[PDB]
Amino acid sequence: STAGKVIKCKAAVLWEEKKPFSIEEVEVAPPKAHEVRIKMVATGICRSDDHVVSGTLVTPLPVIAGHEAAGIVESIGEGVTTVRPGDKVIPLFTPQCGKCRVCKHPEGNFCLKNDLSMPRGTMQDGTSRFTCRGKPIHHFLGTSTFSQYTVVDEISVAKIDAASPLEKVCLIACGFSTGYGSAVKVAKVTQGSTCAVFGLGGVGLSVIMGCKAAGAARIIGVDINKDKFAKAKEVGATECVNPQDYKKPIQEVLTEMSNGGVDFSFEVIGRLDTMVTALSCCQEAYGVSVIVGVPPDSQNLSMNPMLLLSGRTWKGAIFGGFKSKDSVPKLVADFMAKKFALDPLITHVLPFEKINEGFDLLRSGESIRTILTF
Amino acid sequence: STAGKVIKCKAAVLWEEKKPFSIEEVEVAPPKAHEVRIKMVATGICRSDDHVVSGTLVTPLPVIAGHEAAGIVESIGEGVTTVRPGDKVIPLFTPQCGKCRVCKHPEGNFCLKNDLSMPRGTMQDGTSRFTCRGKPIHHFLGTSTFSQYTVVDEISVAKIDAASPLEKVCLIACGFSTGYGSAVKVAKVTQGSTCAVFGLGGVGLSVIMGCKAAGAARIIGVDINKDKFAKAKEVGATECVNPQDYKKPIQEVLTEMSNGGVDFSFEVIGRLDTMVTALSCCQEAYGVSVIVGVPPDSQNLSMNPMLLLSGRTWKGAIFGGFKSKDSVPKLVADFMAKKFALDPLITHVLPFEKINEGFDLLRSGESIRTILTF
Ligand SMILES: NC(=O)c1ccc[n+]([C@@H]2O[C@H](COP(=O)([O-])OP(=O)([O-])OC[C@H]3O[C@@H](n4cnc5c(N)[nH+]cnc54)[C@H](O)[C@@H]3O)[C@@H](O)[C@H]2O)c1
Ligand SMILES: NC(=O)c1ccc[n+]([C@@H]2O[C@H](COP(=O)([O-])OP(=O)([O-])OC[C@H]3O[C@@H](n4cnc5c(N)[nH+]cnc54)[C@H](O)[C@@H]3O)[C@@H](O)[C@H]2O)c1
Ligand SMILES: OCc1c(F)c(F)c(F)c(F)c1F
Ligand SMILES: OCc1c(F)c(F)c(F)c(F)c1F
Ligand SMILES: [Zn+2]
Ligand SMILES: [Zn+2]
Ligand SMILES: [Zn+2]
Ligand SMILES: [Zn+2]
């Protein structure tokens, strides 16, 4: 009965940077060819969503943000073959078109149809499916999950197990998969190795999970908020350090602790200084450092390339290096089979209507993941 | 007999930066325990030696430079087991102690006994075997090949094929092995790939040789000196481009040429700007860039970490990633078995007494490798 019709529903609209979300009615157009309209069930609050508010991440405004979610297909546009109405699905903030040079490459996942490099805030066809107060509203990363209903391109949705608990598996849409893949896929952490993880939020805890899964002997968590240490130890940290406790820079402390540098380091914060510190603290001849955190818009870091000439490897990744549409259903299946845990990331649950409280919890330092229910 | 005695011989002493070498008599002490004294046969002129003259590289002066050589063992100190008097040998500017965490690591080569990071310009025991006009003279990288005789620590020498032509295989001591290994071992260039090589000197040409041996389909040479293009094509470059011919930055040109970025790029110059250009021209999701060129002392580059967050890998290496004492004898064996060529790198052969003329050929752009013969 809603198929082919505009849906009026509530969404969280961001009209201006550095302001609360406005929970208000929007109009959601029906899906066009190769589009899917989804009734959202659950969405996480990721620090990247907060970056849109802060202006750390620049995307066109006004916008419907949100990218870490799961829901149920309401309708499909003409030509959709990969999902049907009533399927559980995860929107993919990194698409998988399956046709570009990246999608065809065995190690590529940053599909060329993404809306991350140079955000337009549209559907693939350059238009918007959202109206609010009679004004067009931007999409975000082709997902826009802070809405009771969204419309996504087919290449930005994956069908998942019909028995999935959506209020848990929404974390597979960003923070778990990112952190876990950054360790197991991107860094390829080895058994018996020493790892350092900068930032112990939902993504850095997920990095720890992956390092533990990979068999690391030592996993050193690094955060300026010591309240984050207990959960980091629960999921696999062997020791935690707060840079503020030390007179010396933490790259020197970590080099000492690891008897000459760590095997693998991860930046999971989004600071230029900790990206350089994390590179420096990995062993100079064979160490690997992975950037996961989102840097502030248009800012350059400064570093000495001798850090690389000695033998270090420096890399970054989006979404843990996972090809998104292939990987999300497998990761859900693996969760179903208890191959990893999501509950340690979930610290708070709120209704969608309390989104602003959920952001307040992230900004205060209290939460890891708040899951919003529609 | 010379064994156990001070040798008075000829050497090229560098008394201060930005001056010609002084060809004069030095005294060479006999080797102490675990040291080897070598009669030099041939040495190449590597740009890194020029860096010591120019102040691009800081190392204690006065000094006997030179690091790309081969010779014949004159005598051995107590406890040497790996070479004997009369053996052909290559001094190793990156040692292989075999005992440190790097030497024990399957992918490490930058042995902690090296004299590159924080140069002392001595033997392992912190003393010098060289004097000139009554003054102690520094070693360089544990090698000091610009001398009729040197003394090296055993961990800094490899025994090579007794039938080796030392006037050719001296290039395995630095420039061939560095470039070749940078392609085949550090980048791991793939069959069918597209590579970009910045800098078409002896090292860059050896990178091309490696990229061709690895089966690359396209190898784009980049140099501001178009006189370097003909030899680059002879050894495998499919295209050459001079940045100076273009209105656009060369990263844009190379991105366009490669239909979205190269698979592998190499910086083989030693400039901060070309290190960032080389990173940028590799494909953003799966590209790999390797820094080979030695940067100027204490200078930082500026870059946008989004270049890495999309998926690029950035790495550097010394000596092509090769564990030096294991690798150099095998490389010489492979050359003897016609597995690669060295003659394309040798443009000039001069007596040692013409060292200054050899440096002038390098600085003017004319030469690739000048070999000095003792
Ligand atoms: N690459 C991707 O695909 C991807 C995916 C998800 C998130 N992100 C980014 O990853 C980062 C972490 O996200 P999250 O886990 O949701 O955020 P979060 O919950 O804010 O966690 C960040 C942690 O960093 C800690 N921190 C802040 N400053 C410092 C400091 N100077 N030193 C040490 N610790 C410090 C902070 O206390 C917090 O616990 C953010 O920048 C996200 O935008 C990237
Ligand atoms: N990593 C190692 O182990 C290692 C070993 C050997 C050499 N090196 C370094 O590698 C670099 C190359 O050494 P080499 O081949 O003997 O030197 P070289 O013979 O001077 O070659 C450098 C080339 O770069 C070209 N060039 C200069 N500026 C530019 C520019 N802006 N854009 C493009 N091309 C440019 C120049 O014309 C020349 O052909 C030097 O910095 C060495 O110190 C490092
Ligand atoms: O948290 C995932 C995430 C990113 F990794 C980004 F790089 C980005 F720009 C963004 F908007 C985003 F949501
Ligand atoms: O050409 C080899 C070479 C290097 F790669 C350096 F990094 C360096 F400092 C040096 F002195 C050297 F000779
Ligand atoms: Zn694609
Ligand atoms: Zn996210
Ligand atoms: Zn060693
Ligand atoms: Zn050299």
Question: What is the Cα gyration radius of chain B?
Answer: 20
Distance CA B156, CA B124 (A): 10
Residue A272 at interface with chain B, using a CB cutoff of 8 Å? yes
Buried-exposed string B305-338: b where 16+ CB fall within 10 A, e elsewhere:
bbbbbbbbbbbbbbbbbbbbbebbbebbeebeee
Residue matched to tokens 């100190």: B77
Method of determination? X-ray
Given the residues B147, B170, B174, B258, the one annotated as active site? B174
Amino acid occupying residue B286: Y
Task: Nearest by CB to B109, from A275, A285, A308: name it.
Answer: A285
B157, two tokens: 């020498």
Task: Nearest by CB to A300, from B260, B302, B312: name it.
Answer: B302
CB A332, CB A164: distance < 8 Å:
yes
DSSP characters for B103-126?
HHSTT--S-TT-SSSS---S-TTS
Beta strands in A87-209 (DSSP E): 88-91, 130-132, 135-137, 149-153, 157-159, 194-198
DSSP state of B191: T
* Beta-strand pair B288-291/A288-291: unpaired
Amino acid occupying residue B251: Q
* Residue closest to A47 by CA, chosen among A362, A364, A365: A362
Distance CA A162, CA A165 (A): 9
DSSP characters for B52-110?
HHHTSS---SSEE---SEEEEEEEE-TT--S--TT-EEEE-SS---SSSHHHHSTT--S
Q: If you count residue pairs, one on A and one on B, with CB atoms under 8 Å apart, how many are there?
A: 129
* Beta-strand pair A288-291/A313-316: parallel
Distance CA B263, CA B94 (A): 29
CB A144, CB A83: distance < 8 Å:
no
Q: Which residues of B touch A302 (CB under 8 A)?
A: 300-302
Q: Given 3.40.50.300, 3.30.70.1230, 3.40.50.720, 3.20.20.210, which CATH number is that of A176-320? A: 3.40.50.720
Q: Is B181 annotated as a binding residue?
A: no
Q: Which residues of B touch A259 (CB under 8 A)?
A: 101
Please tell me the number of the ligand nearest to residue B111's CA. Answer: 7
Which ranges constitute the DSSP H helices of chain B? Answer: 47-54, 101-104, 166-169, 175-181, 202-213, 229-234, 250-257, 272-281, 306-309, 324-336, 355-364
Question: Is B138 annotated in the active site?
Answer: no
Task: Nearest by CB to B295, from A102, A275, A306: name it.
Answer: A306
Distance CA B331, CA B346 (A): 17
At how many Å resolution was this determined?
1.3
Helix (H) or strand (E) holding A42: strand A35-44
> A285 vs B102: CB contact, 8 Å cut-off?
yes
A212, two tokens: 């533990």
What phi, psi does A115 have (nearest 5°)? -115, 30
A135, two tokens: 């004004």
Residue B344: Cβ within 10 Å count: 19
Distance CA A119, CA A60 (A): 7
Amino acid occupying residue B88: K
Q: Is A147 annotated as a binding residue?
A: no
Residue A225 at interface with chain B, using a CB cutoff of 8 Å? no
Distance CA A372, CA A11 (A): 12
* Residue closest to A357 by CA, chosen among A370, A343, A374, A344: A370
A367, two tokens: 């939460």
Sort residue B321 into left (φ over 0), alpha (ψ -120 to 50) or beta.
left
Name the residue of B205, B223, B250, B345 to mutate for ligand 2: max ligand atoms within 8 A of Cβ. Answer: B223
Distance CA A159, CA A148 (A): 18
Q: Can you tell me whether residue A305 is helix, strand or coil?
A: coil
Q: Is B319 annotated as a binding residue?
A: yes
Residue B273 at interface with chain A, using a CB cutoff of 8 Å? no
A335, two tokens: 């969760």
Distance CA A181, CA B221 (A): 35
